[model samples]
Structures are given as structure tokens and as C-alpha cells.
Target: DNRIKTVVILGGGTAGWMTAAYLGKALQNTVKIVVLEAPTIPRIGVGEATIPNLQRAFFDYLGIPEEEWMRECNASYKMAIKFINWRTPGEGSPDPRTLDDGHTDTFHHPFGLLPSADQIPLSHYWAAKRLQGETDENFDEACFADTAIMNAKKAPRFLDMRRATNYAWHFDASKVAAFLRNFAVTKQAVEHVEDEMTEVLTDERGFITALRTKSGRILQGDLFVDCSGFRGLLINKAMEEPFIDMSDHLLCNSAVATAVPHDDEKNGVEPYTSSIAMEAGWTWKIPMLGRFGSGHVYSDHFATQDEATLAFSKLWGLDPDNTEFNHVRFRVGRNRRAWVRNCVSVGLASCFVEPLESTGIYFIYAAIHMLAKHFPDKTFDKVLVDRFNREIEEMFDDTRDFLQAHYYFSPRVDTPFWRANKELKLADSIKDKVETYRAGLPVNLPVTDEGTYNFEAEFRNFWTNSNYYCIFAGLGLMPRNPLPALAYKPQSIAEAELLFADVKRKGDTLVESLPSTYDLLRQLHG
Candidate 1:
């Protein structure tokens, strides 16, 4: 009856330990935390690719040394995603031809923190130039974003950038889970349980009473945290909160994942994730130290699970049966109430969009931090819970809409899955941003109605605007020319080039001295 006395976390994979470690550290000795993991159910540890915030999660929350985690996870640094064949020439593919249509199979969506050397933020420059009606010849030719989508058919090495880039990692998912588990036990003194949850006990008002494990042991806690994957044992099964399906927003329903040894010469590791277009959907190729973790994510309605698996194998010249590939099916969305009653769902239990943006780790960290900031005592105030749930929904919806934008903006109509994306109904928020951008106005910028509050953070504003401009121009929302008013002035060009050189030098130094992902982790841990 007192405020929350104990917190019981169900399941002990990456999500469970992640939740446990954070709760243990944030609450410290204020409340006892226990993690219940079932030995019978193996963790679906296929989430190896991560965004830049992963560093924040390790360094800020868990206090695990980055260098150590890198080595343990067989990690490789990722600067951006290399999208191959998402758009192709009209004769061969269904998309309209771009200026540089016939060149190659890939284009980078890089991760640089700063704008290009011309001092023009990519999207604004492109959009402004289009408004001017100056032909493509008038624009700066070597602009990284333009070249990436236009000419460069491969991931840019760190050297290609003109500034220090915001990077992420491609690692071994299983190794990462193991590494984090070890780090949690040694670094955070986290309590772990290796038993499956057989039953969830609830009191009169449907609050978790205690959990009964498969091994016939009962673990009691004042609060419950669900990291039990998509089954959402505690949150969905026990709490009965409705699952909000976001399938329309994120149509990829299944992923066929397998690890392939990298070919020494041809398929050697690259410093990014490669999302190559497949017939049914898109395939993700994440490079690790020695092997490539590849997966094809497709809509089940359009392709059989076997078809997807075979497609992955065909792309890599491997036999599907020779290698073990797991088909993971999931409805893309989150719970209407992530924090329902006394329990909170984190990680996959909380929500998962398709991994198009590598947002899984970010979501987990966000949930942990949010819960820590608003930990509910025995008071169980409905107001606080409602707010927390509301925030979670907003986060999930925002991410869903962003991912949806990618599909909706694609010009591909080659296959049923691709066709669906073009015709699919999108979230109202996304629709508004698209319409606003079409009007030659800044939409999805920090100043927009959707982005005004809780989004004015300068850096975020720039990034969102950049993406908005990219999709807008990449899909031919506007002409490929320079606006007379916004066209670059010669005086400004000279000044910008000088400024760019300074930043370029800094970026070069960072890249040259950038530690190996493994070494970086070890150094931090040491």
C-alpha cells in the first residue's frame, strides 16, 4: 500500500537488462529491482544496428566503457545508411529518371553533424535552388548530399565528409546482448533471474501482485516492468492495455535475418548499414568485424516467409538452407498505454517501428530515462501515468510517421509492397508536413506547427528540415533548379568555402584519429 517498494522486470535479454541496469542505477538503493529471465526462451537478439544515441545510453546510463562494448559486440562504426536501388532509372525500374539515374546501385544518407562546405544546409539549398529556376548546372556540383543521391553509388568513407560526422555502430546482436549482460552485472550490480514467467498475479484492481515463474518460483514486487518482447506478457497479456497497430504507417511485417561471413575481397566490411531494395521489400546488410548480418524485411501479405528468405540468399549467393535464418513477424506499432497500471513496457514491448532508422535502442533508452524521471510510487497517480503514456504514444507516432515518409515518398512501383507504399494513407502529421513542404514553405522544420514545441532544439530543427527537403526534392516535389532569390551569391560563396575548409580540416583530423570501434570500447572500459 506504500509507494512502489520493489520493481520486477520480466524477461532478461537486452531489453530486460537494459531496463534493469537503468532502474538500478537511477533508483540505486531507494528501491529493489529484480530481472526475471526465462532460460527456455532465447532472446531475439537480432538488433545489431544502432543510432548515435547508443553511445549516450552506454556512457550516460549504464556507465559501461564504450571500447569494451565494441570489442564484445564485434562492432563496426557506421556513418550512415547506404541505400541501393531504392530509386532507379525508369526503363529498368518503376521510378522516374533522376539527373544521375544510370550510374550505380547505392547512395549514401550520411551522418555528418554539420552542413556541407557551401555553408548551405542540404535541404534548404536544394529547395531554394529549385525555386530559382536556375538549371542543375548552376548548383554546387560536389555537394555531398546531392552527389550521394545523384552520383556516388556507395557509402562515403569517413574521409569523404567535410565535418565530424554523427555515427552509430553495426555489431553482433547476440554478442551485444551478452556483453551488456556482463557489463550490467559487474558495473551496475544488477540482479538477474534465468526462468520464464508462467503466470502473472494481479490484485483486485488488476495491478501486478507477483510473477510466477516456469520453475515454480514466485517473485513479488510492488511494480512490474515488461521487456518480454512482442508477447508483452505483463503489459499486454496481464494488464490488458490495447495494442495500437501501426501497420499502415510501417508496412513491413516480417524480417528474415541471417549472418553471413563476409567475403574478404568483394563483401568486406563497410562502415554503414546497406539497405538494398529487394523484390518483396528491402534487405538490410549490417557489417560487423568478421561477418555481415543480413536480413530481408518484407510485407507478409505480399510474399511468403520462404520467399523472403530465398531472396536474401539469392542476393548474397548463398543457400538459404545452409545458413540459419530466422523469420520474425511483428505488427509495427506500440501500446496505447506503455505505462499501464503499475507496470511499464520497454523496448520491443513498448514499441517497434521497422528498423529503417535504427530507432530500437533509442526507444529503449528513452523509456528508461522517462520512467526514472517519473517513477511512480505506491500512490499510482493516474494523472502521471496518463501523461507518461501520452508521451510514449507521441514518440512512437512521430517515429512511425518519419519512417512512413520514406515509403510514401518513394517513387518505386515495381512490386506490390512498393506499390502499397505509394498509395498508402499516411498519418495526418506526415500529410501536413508533406503539404507544407510542397507549398515552398519550411515544413517539419523546428518552427512548424508539429515541430514548434518540444522540437525547437536547434540541431534537431536542422536535421528534420534537411530530411524533409531531401524527400521532397528526391521525389521531385519541386524542380531541380536554383531559385533566383535564394541562389548563392559569389561573395557568400567565397566566405562559405573558407569556413568550410576550416570545418573540413577538423573533420579530417577526427576521422584520421577515430579509434577502431572495438578499440574505442576497450579504451572506455579500461
Candidate 2:
């Protein structure tokens, strides 16, 4: 009945350890933190890709050095996601001949801001150029950031200092979980229990009271955190929290993941992730230091498990019968209440969108940070709980809408899957945003009428706006009108040419001076 003095975490994957590390460090000895991880349950180690924000929020905030983290997790730099065939082949598409010998029809959604031209945003200038029918052979060269960093295959850091480039990591998920677990135990002094939870005990008011484990231990705590993956042992199984299904918006429900060794002669470590379009879904190709983590996420409604497995095997030239691939089936949705009563759900237990954008890790980082910020006392005020629920719902919905946009606006109608995706019903919020963008309204320009949709304030931020532009432009869905009068000044074709050449020259030089990504990894390990 006193203030929350002890916290118990259920499960121990990346999410559980991340929560332990943050809470244990922030609360110190004021709160006794314990993590109960069932040794029998294996972790879902497929989420290997992450967005740039994970580095700052999770690693940096936890005081983990970058070099140490990289070496421990077999991490590699990811500057962008090179989307292949998300858009239909067109005259403006990347030349198949110019791409990495085997790659074709790709466009990069590079991280970082586009270089400004004469104090005007390069995006506006490029959109204007496209409108003017100034077609180029190389799509990447048209965007300053892509040409400067991603297309050149350059890492962001140089001599232990970051440059203009923004980047993320592709790592071994299991190693990351283990690394964070060690950090939590050694650095944060969090208690760890290895045993299976046999039963969950709750009081009459539906508040979690204690957990009964197979080791004959009854663990009681002031609060509970569920990181039990999709099973939702505490959040759903015990609390009976409702789940909001998002199948209508996202169709990919199953994934087959496998690791393939890298061929040094054929494939040097490139500073980006590759999301290649497939018949029934998309396949993610993430490069680590020693190997590549590849997965085929497809809908079971359209194809059988065997079909998807064979397709995935063929893509990587592996024997379908002999290939050891981990198959996972999941629902696309979020819990109605991320925080209900005394227990809160994180990671897959809270929500799971398809991994197209590498948002899985970011969501885990976000959930723990949010909980820490508004951690409740013994009273558990309803106002704080309501606000936390609203914030988390907004976060999930925002990510859902963004991911849905990728499918809703795609022009790849070649397969039944793509056609079905095009015909799927969209949330009114997404419909409004797409309509607004098509009408040439500026990103984050508020739409009239609050009944149908309410855009979050974070939508106006540069990264979100840039992400929308990249997806829209890559899919050949450019705005119908030219740049607004207030945006950029009229520039002659010759002036645009000069600026492009200058930027390309500087970017190429910087890339040339930097060591190769593989070389950098070796040096870090050395």
C-alpha cells in the first residue's frame, strides 16, 4: 500500500532487459527491480534491424559506448533502406543496369536531411525538377542525402566523430538481448530469476498480486511489466485486455527468418538495409558484421506456409528442404490498453506491426521510456494511466498509418497480393493524409474538421515529413501541383545543374576518403 518500491518484469528478451536497464538505472536502489525470465522459453530473435533513434535513446541513454555495443552485438551501420520494386518499372526508375550487378529497380530512403540549395529545401527543388520533366538516369543522384551518403555506401562516423549523415544498426538480436541483460545485472544491479511462471495471482480488484513460478517461489511486487512476446502471459492471459485488430490495414501475418553468410568477394558490407518486394509480401535483407539476417514476411491468407518457405529459399538460393528457417505466425494489432491496472505490456505483447520499416526495436525503446517518465505510485491515479494510454495509442496508430501508406499507395499490381492490398480498406486518418498530400498540401498542414482525424504534433517533425516524401516520391505518387509560392524560389535549369554537381563532387570525395564498412568493422573488433 506504500509507494511503488518494487517492480517485477516478466520475460527477458530485448524488451525485458531494456526495461530493466532503464528502470534499474533511473530508480537506483530506491526501487527493487526483478526480472523473471523462463529459461524454457526461447526469445524471438528476429528483430535485427532498428531505426536511427535506437542508438540515442537506448544505447546512449544507457551509457553504453558505441564501439563496445557494436562489437558485442555484431552490428553494422545502416544509412538507409534501399527499397527494390516497391514502385512499378517506369522511365524514371533506377536503371537496372547501373545497380549492384544483381540488384534492380531500387530507390533509397536515406537517413538525414537533404542538402539545402540556396537556403531552400532540396526536396522542394527536386519535386520541382521532376514536375519540369528533368529526368535522370540515376534516381539516387537526384536526392542530395541519398547521393551524398547512401548511394556512395558511406558510413556516418569518421574518426570517432559523426558527420552530416544519420544512421542506425543491423545486429544480432539475441546478442543484443544478452548484452543488455549483462548491463542490467552488472551495471544497474537488477535481480534476475530464471524460472517458468506457473500461475499469476491477482487480488479481487483485478490488480496483479504475485507470480507463482515452477521453482516454488511466490514473487510479489508493487508493479508488473509484461514482455512475454505474443503470448501476453500477464497483459492479456491474466488481465483479459482487449486487442484491436489491424488485419484490414496490414496483411502480412507470417514470417520465415534465416541467416545467410556473407560472400566477401560478391557482397561487401553496404551501409543500408534492403527491403525487396516479393509476390505475397516483402523480404528484409539486413547486413551484420559476419552474415545477413533475411526474412520473408507474407500473408497466410494468400499463400500457404510451404509456398512462402519455398519462395524465400529460392530467393537466397538455398535448399528448401535443408534450409533451417524459423517460421513465425502473428496477428497485426495492438492491445486496447497498453497499461491496464497494475500491469503494462511492452514489445510484441503491446503491439506488432509488420517489420517493413524496422520499427520493432524503436517501439520497445519508446514503451520503456514512456513508462519510466510517468511511473505510477501506490495509488495508481487514473488520470496518469489514461494519459499514458492515449500517448501509446497515438504512437501505435501513427506508426500503423505510416506503414499502411506504403501498401495503400503502391503501384505494384502485378501480383494478386499487391492487387488485394490496393483494394483493402484504409483507416479514415490515412485516407485524409493521402488526399491532403495528393492535393499538394504541405506535410503537417492541418486538415479541416476534427471529427474524422486528428494528426499528432509529432507528424510535423522533419523526419516524419521526410519519410512521407520519400515513400510518396518513390512510389511515383508526387503531388499534383508545383512547389508552393512560400517554399522555394524559381531556379533556372542551369543553376540546379551547378548545385547538383557541387553536392555530388563533395559527397563523392567524402565517401572516397572514408574506409570501407568491412574495414571499419575489422578495426572496431581489433
Candidate 3:
């Protein structure tokens, strides 16, 4: 029978452990699972931020208790990302700041949906208001999720057995990996082997058959999963799956990460991540319960490693001469095929994009989800493998285009890096999408044509129309003309105004009633 009986996972970091936990729980009693963790391999461990879908797709699906997971990982709530200086100084900024000298444009991409009524979408009204020179209110303020929840610096909670708001987490990556490892071993009965793979043994068809460990033991499996980070021990080194280089389109290839103590009393724990634009790249600030995980992701093509590090240190208000930093080098692309033969790659072994939108762990979870859905046997159906590869490739391409959108439409011509970003040729896919938006069409609305994007089905739950609208409005890239003659508009402007005011009032009240993020952490830990 071509049924898979045993599965071997290589490298035991977050990716490995997460896979083990999910598979162990899912295939418990049916298939045996073993994890080979190289004692010498060090985890890159800088992806400490996540999106809200992570909660549903990974933790909840795995039946992990939220409070327990948070406590173990030193996690804290993240309602959204407050993008600072992402736009040129202008109106329509989501979180406009007035410094001593001038105004700094800022915006927020919140976790949940934009509130809308039956008659019209809130975004259309907001855009109409802007068109009418009504600059009194910002675009994001009209967003119930952003202004009402995240902007007020309040943590979302469970009320009446339902979550009051959408949120994700900022946690210690190393701790999370360790926690998952324990969970997989104790709760799911996954065998953990602490040894390095010294060699790979293959069959006549070049499919992985067994792994030779440094401890002189041979680990055999019907299927092998590569969680070997960027090393790609089995998928690349053995299977020779070619990497599709996306560097020309997505330029960031390096990152410098460090942890710093929280300002506690000064800043407390902001219930959101802060993505601040830098000269050559951008910096991410993820607030955990005890400390902040900070990093600068920049392109090496325009700036040296030292320059990037210095820039990051300066931005974080740290002395570079004294601070310790972990530097990482990566390529921006995915494997030609994540699953080839009896081998499949997850996490860094599969693909890597700059952590601009917190998509690193996302890809891992998504890949695992796909694998769970399409669990295969020894037959290793080529058609099934081809479909998996196509889906993964689509995911990577979509994410790449999204990240590039942040750069391609940016107004920051102050630095050479920013200038180069604007000068680069955007992917044709991106160009088409942007053009569609610029023509005042609903980018997310589905068409009936074959192979056309079904946004309502595929992306409605996450990265919806509201998400794209936030970026479009924030960057002052709104279409010059209004929507078509048949576009939906508020039936009564007065009613829409009243609704907007009501949302603001409720948001303010919620902010006043809820405890601060730090207090919530204290309560959780206690």
C-alpha cells in the first residue's frame, strides 16, 4: 500500500515543532512522527510578530488555550501595525502627528473589518468626503476597528464567550519554539531526536529514504519534511528544488534584530506593532510582555550591513557601539516546488520574504495547513504535488506583490534607497492590480471570467478590501477620479455621519473601560 506510515521532520525550531504538534495531534495513532533536531543548528529566531489569522489557523485549530500560550511565550496583544512616516506629509493620514517642526504622516492597518451599514460601504463615504474637500477627519478614524479598538490603545478581550476585537501577538520566538516542542512531545507523543543529519540516503528514484545522523543512527521515514531553515538540507541539497529569485522585484535581503527592555512606565505596552520607515529599509517594533523585539529589514544592494545596523540602532535610540545585534542574510523567493517526491519543505526551507507584513510564520502555518488538508500516502501523486506547488507559488507571489506595493507607490524620494525602489520595474501583476485600482474599480470585487481572482472567496476573511483601502488612502495613492456612475454611495449622508459618530463614541468608551495592555499582561502572568 502507498499509505504513509511514518514521517520524519528535520530541524526542530518553531517550524519543526509546530509541524510536529499539528501532525502529532492530527495523525495521532494513525502515523508515527519523529523530529530530528540538530544540536548544532542555531535558529534565526527574529520573526516575533504575527497576524490575527494565526490565532484561528494555528492555535485554535490545534486546541491550544490562548492564555496558556500567551503566558508561556511572553506574548502580548497586537491589534494592528502603526505605520510611521510611511507616506509623504499630507492629509488623509490615519494617525497624523504634529512634531515640533511639522506634521509626520502615519497610518494604521488594523486587524479586523471596516464597519459598514446596509446602504453603503464606509470607505466609499470616506473617499467621497475627501473628494469634497472635507479634510476634518482622517480616513482611518472612520474605521471602527482601527479608531475604536487599536487607536485608543486598548486590548481586545473575550466578552460573552466571543472575542471583542481582532488581534494577534508579539512574543519571544525562541520561547515559542521551546513551548511548542514541549507541547508536541507531551500532549501529542511525537518522538524528539537530538542529532544532526550527517548524510541523506536516497532510493533509485532519488527520493529521500533515510537520514544518517551524526550519532551513527539511521532515521527512516516514508515522508520527510524539511524545516531546516534556509539550509534546505533535504529539499534543496538533496532534492535540488530550484529557487525562484524574486530579488529584482522584492529587494530587502538582510535584517538586524535585537531585544530591548520596555520603557514600562513611559510607553507601557502599546497594543500594536510599529513599522517605521528607515532610510534604506524599515524597522519593526514588536512589544512583548517584558521586552520589545526590534529589527531593521533593509536591502544590502543599497546599504552595507554596518550601515543598516547603525541606522537601526539610531532609530531605536541605542548606542550601536554597546548594543548587541543579530544579523541575518536571506533571499526573497520560494522554491519551484515545496513538495517534490517524498520530501516537502516548510518555513524557511520553503520560502522567505522580508517580514514587512509579518508573513514569515504565516507561510509556515499556511503550508502546514495545506499539507494537513492534502495529506498524502506513498503514491506521491504528481498531480497533487503540482497543485500544492501552484498554490504555494501563488501565495508567495501575492505576498511579494503586496510588499512591493508598499514601496512602488511610496512618495519618499528623500533617500537613494527610496528613489531606487520607485525606479524599479514593478511586477506586471502588481502593475495590473494598481492600474485596476487607479481606474476607480473595486479591486476586490470578483469577476465571472475563468481563472479570475475570486477575492470574496479567497481573501475576504483576511487582507480584504478595507486592508487595501487603508494602504491606498494612507499613501495618498487614491484614484484621481471617483468610482463609476453605478458605484455604491451612502443613501443619506446624515445617517452615515451619525453612524460614524456613534462608532467613535463607542470606541472611546471601550478604551476608557478596558485595562491597559501591560495590566492585562500582569493579570495573565499572575
Candidate 4:
């Protein structure tokens, strides 16, 4: 009883299936894995967009090769996220049109490494130029090769499967769930059930004992993972753990999701997702092979659900009377503690930040990674449990800090949402970082014995200072002055112009060399 023998996951969809597959691989059949999927529970089916980690981490974990199942999901590559009109307002034409307007208010949050300028981090030179009010290219365009590839509508991969840059994906959430379900069940050695959980049984110590199902079967396990979406059946209803409210920090609580056909499939399926700023929050357009996953997120305080829905339909040039629009509602926050007693909560049941930066699925992936690292047994070592809870909560908070920066640093003040965001309370981490960044670029701490610099303990989240620099550079919030450390390096600022020119040349070459995303997917899928 002191060791984990059986693990049970409640609910189905991306969360439960991802967990099942991951644990099935992690436990290696030594421990039994079971999943109870309620057949009648409808999926939210809104997380159609994702960050790059899933491709790098999730699929590899299950040995679910891309060529095998990606075509079935109709998935496509995503090199970056293009943020339109988040800075100054655009002429309202930043969506799917290649009409370049000299880059007044568009930038990218591209995945992958930040290329340096002249052996030094690019942000220094980027800051040196911004302080002088000299702009040649957007931060993403200037620093990352992937941005140029995305601009050219190119996939990061060559026909030979060689990669020019790392990539994320846009896929059918429903298909992802189903594919992973089949993979977990048929190949990963996971048990699946279609029965409903009638009740949760717990011992006096508040540890979940078993789940009572409608078929009179009791599913018992030494450890349980709650993927019950927002229902929070075991974690909230049975465990009595309180849900922490994050509404004060994050405002958008509702969204209208709709599908949009590509204007021309031949030239469509751009290699990146787009999040254009809207009246209340923002509207996202994620490109799949055949259609665009479009949605509008807005705060109820500024607009009602119907108002938001109507506005979304209009924004996409859809007739309100005929289009099929799905609306989503969620509290933007995390659990007080993701791990409590013998149960661990994952996905929406654990936390749900606003869908910005497409971190919804990343959170699911992160929970699995963390759970596996601090995996506990039937004895449930007190230290490991406490450590898992602390680590999970910190991950949530760190991600919140990063997401809050997108809102806090934006210069857009057009609508009530943008105007009101000026007064929104920021987490201390964000506030401190913003103020500090205004004074200096966040350079890494140098190693005493070597030339390389190390990421500070504080900047160890999945999103590093490099990620924040893209945001700062995009929003015209670059530091007023180069930090003292870099300012002294005379060649650093002087050579940056030449360095950027070289990068731009290389980027142009990449644009010319890579195949169009459509072409790449066509060759692979067909």
C-alpha cells in the first residue's frame, strides 16, 4: 500500500487523454492506468491553438509520430503568433491580408531561440536603437528567423524533414482528443471506461478513496488525476478545496468561437496564429489546413455574452442570423493547490488562464511533466506532496505574470477593455519586471568561471526573459537606456546595426528557401 499500484484519471478530452498516455509511458506498465470518460459530457472544444512545447515534448513522450496522426487531425504548423493592433491601432487590415503598411502596429511572439547580435543578446542593440527612435524591422522580424519564414507563409521544415525552426500546431481539439484516446488505449496500455462517476468516496482524512460509477463499479486507485474540466468533481466537490479567484488580475471571462473558411485554400494556411486586439479583449484566428479557428474573448463587465457574440460574428464578416457560433465561459484562475491529499488536478480542473499565448494545452503538458517528476506513491510522502503543490502553484503564477504583461505593456487604449486595462492590478512580479526593464535590458547573470551566462532562478519559467523582450520590443517599450553592463561595451551598440543587417540577409534567404506551409503539408499529407 505504500507504493503506487493503480492510477485513475477522471474525464476525457485533451487533458485526460494526454495524462493517460503520458502516465502509461512514464509508469511503463508496472503501474495500472485507467481512464473514466463520461460519454455524455460535452467538450469545451475551444483550445484549437497551442504553443511549440507540445510538438517537442508531448508527442515524443507517447512516440506518436507526426506523419502518422497529424494528417488525420488536419493539423498544421505554427511558427509564431502574430499580434495585430495590440500596440497602436491598425487601419484594421491585419488579418490574413498580406498588405504591408510599414509595420505601424503588428509584431510576433515567435517560438524558438532568440538570435543574438554580434555575440551579445539582440535586446541590447534593439534597445540602443529604440532609445534613439530608429526602427528598421519589428522585434520578431529583426531578431527571429521564424518570423520571416512565417511572413513568407513558409513552413519551418524542408521536404527532407530538416527543420529551419521549431514549430507549434493548430489542430481540431476534438480530433486531438480522439486520436490520443485511441493511442493511449490501443498502444500505450491504458484502460478506458465510458461510465459516469455517480459519486466520489473519501476517507475521514479527506483523501479520495474511490469513484462510484453509474454501473455499480467502484474505480479505485492509489493516485487520481482530476481532468474534469471546470466541473472539478473530485478536487472541488469532494475534496472541499476552494477555487482561487483570479478575476481581479484577468478580466475576459467569455468568448465566441466560430469556424471561418479560408478565403483561398491554395494560398491560405499561413504558418502562424493571429491574435488581433478587439474592443473588449482580443480575437484569435488560428489557421488549420482547411479552415480558420476564430474567436473573440471579452470581459462581461464591458460587454454581455450576446453583445460579444454579435460583435464577433460581425468582425469576421459573418451573417449573425446564419453562422454557427459557440460561446465559452470560464473563470480565469487556478486551484488553491493542484495537489491535495491523494489527488492531483490537471487542465481546466486545475487552472484556466485566458487563452492568450495559447497556454491552455501547455498547462496540461506542464502538469504532466511536473507530476512525473515529483511522482508520489501510496504513502504519499508529505514532502513530495507539498513540493508538488508549491511548484504547480508557482508555475500558474509565473504564467499569469507573463500573460499579464501582454495587457499591461500594450499601448492600445482605444476601447473600454484597453482603457480599463491601464488600471488593472499587476502581480508584483510583473510590476517589478516592467519597472526594471524600463531602466535596463534583462541580461543573464554571468558565470564566474565561464563566458556563458545563466538564466536567473526567477526567470526559469518556460517563458524566459527572451520571450518578454519580444513583447517589450513589439510594444515600443524597449528600455530608455541600455543597461550599464552593456552600455560600457562600445562595440556592442555600434556593431548592432551591421549585425541586424546580416541577420536580415540570412532571414531573407530562409524565406526564399523554405516551402510554403500549404505545400509542405500537402506533400506530407497527400
Query: 219-317 in candidate 3: lDDT tens per residue?
Result: 989999999999898998989989888888878899899888877557777888888887788888888766888888888988899998877877767
> In angstroms, how far off is 76's CA in candidate 4?
0.5
- Candidate 2 residue runs with Cα over 4 Å from true position: 40-47, 89-104, 115-120, 137-140, 159-164, 445-463, 484-488, 491-502
Poorly placed runs, candidate 1 (over 4 Å): 40-47, 89-105, 116-122, 129-164, 264-268, 445-463, 474-526
**TM-score, predicted candidate 4 vs. hidden true structure:** 0.92
Candidate models: Cα lDDT each:
0.66, 0.77, 0.77, 0.78
Measured against the true structure, the TM-scores of the candidates, in listed sequence, are 0.84, 0.90, 0.92, 0.92
Better of 1 and 2 by lDDT: 2
Local accuracy of candidate 4 as per-residue lDDT tens digits, 1-526 = 5678989999998899999988888878888899999886454344377876565477876777777778778788887788887776432334532324455567888875654544567766776665667776566777776777787898888888797877878888888889999988888778898999998888888788889889999998889999999979989888878999888787888888887777535565688888888778888888876678888888989889888877777777789888877877887888898988999999999999887888888788878887998898777888988887887788888888788878888877777788787798888888777777878756332222211222122224466657788787777677767677765777767677677787788779988887788888888778
| Residue 356 lDDT, candidate 3, scale 0-100 | 80
Please, what's the RMSD in Å of model 2? 5.0
**Clash totals, every prediction:** 19, 0, 1, 0
* lDDT of model 2 at position 84: 80
Task: Return the lDDT, model 2, position 297.
Answer: 87
lDDT of 1: 0.66
Ranking by TM-score: 4, 3, 2, 1
Per-residue accuracy of model 2 over 1-526 as CA lDDT, tens digit each: 5789889999998899999998986676789899999875454344387876676667777788878888888888888888887765322122232333343466778765554445444565567667767754333556654445665555666746555466888888888889999989988778899998999898899999899999899999989999999999999899999889899888999998888878733556778888877888888888876688888889998879999888888888889988678999987899999999999999999999988888888788778877887889989998888888887888888888888888888877777788999888888877777777676654653232212221232222423445677788776688787657524455543565676777678677777776666666667766
Error of 2 at 208 (Å): 0.6
